[PDB]
C-alpha cells in the first residue's frame, strides 16, 4: 500500500545513492550493482569510441509504433545471426537505448516499456544460454568493468 510503498521507495533511494557513491570509488553495493555499472560504462565506452558509426546507423532509424517491433527484431536477429559475444551484447543494449531515446523524441513514449520487454525476452530466451556457458555476467564484469 501507499505507506509500505513510501517506506520501500525511500529504502531504494538510499540504496541507489549509496551504490552510486561506492561505484565512484571502485567498490560495489552488490554483484548485481557491479553488473549494472559495468554495462552502463561499457555502453558509454561503446557509444563514445564508435560515435560516428553509432550515430550513423541510428540516424537511419525511422520508427513508427506499427513498425517498431519488426525494426527491433530484424536488427537484433541480424546482430546475432552468426554468433553471440560480449561486444555484440553491449551493442544490443546500446541499440535498445537508442530506440528508446528516439521513441521519446518522436512522442512515441509508449514504445519505451515495450522495447524494454522485447529486450528482456530476447536476453532471457536467446542470449542467456551463451552467457551461462561463458562464465555469466560475473565474467562480463571481469572483462568490461
Amino acid at each position: 500500500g501507499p505507506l509500505g510503498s513510501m517506506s520501500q521507495s525511500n529504502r531504494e533511494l538510499v540504496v541507489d545513492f549509496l551504490s552510486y557513491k561506492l561505484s565512484q570509488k571502485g567498490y560495489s553495493w552488490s554483484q548485481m550493482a557491479a553488473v549494472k555499472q559495468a554495462l552502463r560504462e561499457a555502453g558509454d565506452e561503446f557509444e563514445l569510441r564508435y560515435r560516428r558509426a553509432f550515430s550513423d546507423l541510428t540516424s537511419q532509424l525511422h520508427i513508427t509504433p506499427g513498425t517498431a517491433y519488426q525494426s527491433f527484431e530484424q536488427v537484433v536477429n541480424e546482430l546475432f545471426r552468426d554468433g553471440v559475444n560480449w561486444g555484440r551484447i553491449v551493442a544490443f543494449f546500446s541499440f535498445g537505448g537508442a530506440l528508446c531515446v528516439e521513441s521519446v523524441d518522436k512522442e512515441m513514449q509508449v514504445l519505451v516499456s515495450r522495447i524494454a520487454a522485447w529486450m528482456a525476452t530476447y536476453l532471457n530466451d536467446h542470449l542467456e544460454p551463451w552467457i551461462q556457458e561463458n562464465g555469466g555476467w560475473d565474467t562480463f564484469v571481469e572483462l568490461y568493468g
Binding site: 565506452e45 569510441r49 558509426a53 546482430l79 560480449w86 568490461y144
Partner: peptide, 18 residues
C-alpha cells in the same frame, strides 16, 4: 545496413576487451 554496422562495431569492441 544498420544491423551490419552495429555488428562490425560490436566485434571491434569485443576484440579490444575480450
Amino acid at each position: 545496413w544498420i544491423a551490419q554496422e552495429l555488428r562490425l562495431i560490436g566485434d571491434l569492441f569485443n576484440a579490444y576487451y575480450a
